[PDB]
Amino acid sequence: TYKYVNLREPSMDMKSVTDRAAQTLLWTELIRGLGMTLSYLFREPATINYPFEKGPLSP
Amino acid sequence: VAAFLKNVWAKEPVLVASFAIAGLAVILPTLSPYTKYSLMINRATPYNYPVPLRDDGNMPDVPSHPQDPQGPSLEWLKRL
């Protein structure tokens, strides 16, 4: 069937521009999003120590 | 012209904020009385040596004693 993605007209009123004005000017974007999704560093590194450890196979 | 501030602040929100800092910066030094306190201090900073003068008859004011109430009062700042 259908789906129309990335197809949405803007708000264009008094208050909702302040959500798009604080975004560009003071960067509430790009740090709450992209500075937190990188860190996300505390997870365990899933590395195989190849001369000692070995991975799975199949019969 | 009332939406002209609302069809450019939702269109190019960079230089709009510049003109607001172009404003509110020229006007206010002519407004608050905290200025001319800037002038009274910046003149009352002694760089050079205050050389005394010669008496002849008068004496309108200011005898030789420095700790006498003979000159002005800039000592409001220490009380400020």
Side-chain angles (χ1 to χ4, degrees), chain B residues 32-50:
Chain B
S32 294
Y34 287 162
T35 191
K36 191 184 71 65
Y37 290 159
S38 177
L39 190 144
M40 190 177 290
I41 300 301
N42 202 1
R43 190 179 63 85
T45 59
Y47 291 166
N48 295 318
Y49 184 77

Side-chain angles (χ1 to χ4, degrees), chain A residues 1-5 7 10-18 20-35 37-39 41-59:
Chain A
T1 63
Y2 288 160
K3 186 180 288 294
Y4 290 93
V5 293
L7 197 147
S11 66
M12 193 181 289
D13 51 353
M14 183 65 76
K15 186 66 182 295
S16 174
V17 175
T18 67
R20 290 187 295 273
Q23 180 181 1
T24 303
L25 192 62
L26 266 72
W27 291 339
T28 184
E29 195 267 329
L30 191 67
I31 291 94
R32 178 186 57 83
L34 289 174
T37 316
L38 179 59
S39 174
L41 78 99
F42 293 154
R43 294 179 183 270
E44 293 293 327
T47 63
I48 292 97
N49 192 358
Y50 174 70
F52 297 156
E53 302 169 351
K54 289 181 184 293
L57 292 185
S58 174

